[PDB]
Amino acid sequence: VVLSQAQAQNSQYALARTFATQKVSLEESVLSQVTTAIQTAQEKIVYAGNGTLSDDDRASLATDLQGIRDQLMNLANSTDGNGRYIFAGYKTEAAPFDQATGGYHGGEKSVTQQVDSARTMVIGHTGAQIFNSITSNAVPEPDGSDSEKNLFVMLDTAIAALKTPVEGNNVEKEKAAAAIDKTNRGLKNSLNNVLTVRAELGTQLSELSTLDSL
Template structure:
């Protein structure tokens, strides 16, 4: 069989190119530390590595989201801590305002102090995160959520929550809206007593307590109405205000000061001398005024008004007692929200631990798929180097086969 010289050259060159290419490939693997430089090196492993890399990137986004959420909740917790302090200071002043020996000027001083706390509370309600994003506007974070006007303080935000995807199947609220914090109470807050501003007697009430939450009437708004009977004896009747018209609860009961009144699973004491038509409302907390700003403004206005008669003093005492109860409910609500914030931050810590472990697993899987076995690669490198040298030497010998060198 005759083989052309050109064929010998082509085959020799192809053999050397193949060996050089293999040697270069191993050099690139050694330089990068990766066993897969192109998908063709190992299509199955390359596909798996791509999937793992994508999953790791998504896991990294969850970690970023958790960090942002934790920062937002930490900022909210700092603000709520200040709200708690202000609310407790308000409670202290309300107890002081209930001192019946205070003069008009003393009460005005307390009212001034309460107005300062009112302004602090409003400022905290309009807190931002330092970047112009308001904390308590719900999803409306670009403008202040609370605005003071002649009618009081209005909430301009919404009741939504900014939800953050903090893990594969977990969305978490990165904050709470202002209505849930400053204009709401917990459903378990019980009852609030409120005297009518038109009362002309001197009847006052203490704090209401729950005695039987299983009572059929528990949770319904009630009203005590005082009226003297034909013999001149002062009596009170209780009506269920949840119906139209209001439904009487029992019959008229003689009133004697003080009277321990038990109705609808609650108990409270009424003292003093009521007049015909005087009323006391017994309302569930959610129906008795839940706006912290409105409740505080009512007490401030009452304290600023001079007291000329015993009726004025009784109405002020009732207003302060109502305020004390309302702010006890408001403080419970703020503390409940703070507990929710703390619970979410604790959950984020747990999710971070899970996410870190997951990221480590992904890294280990990628290492097994992509990282180079240096011992094997170096051995292969020397084998390819020897093969290349053999190809070069054989080519030199073959290209030297020429009959002309033997002619002389």
């Protein structure tokens, strides 16, 4: 009895595993795209650091950035093949991020799944974890204020700043330039956060395959 039984318990963990592997692989694929998108915005933000840019050049950068922001929003709202949202924790049936502000509305608890007697492997990192978090490596705000954690806020503030024509207004220029500097720090912090998650999903995939190929 205990044999058949155990062999059936390990037969079941085998299924969880197969479910876990497809879920983690899609997340990893989508996060790979999130990385490239943020790196693209980072390049525009660096260009925006140039003090002699035309207001029309600045507005152009804002438009490029709105586009990247919109790609990232679509990635943050990604679903799997059954239309369940992958960055929403357990709340898989409503979009985790609102279009207007990029606020997170999904679940807070990470999705877990029993993989082997021993472990309880975290599957499905939540939206908060990817798009609204920073690691301990985060570059702090020079002025001691709290670091922005929400990627969409980082992008949205920069966009609003760049769309503000600042010709002939040094005060507005310094303000907008400070917003761009803040976004620059934030995007490094966001990139580091996404890189951290991707590495951890890589580990998860490695584990799953080590029990799957086992």
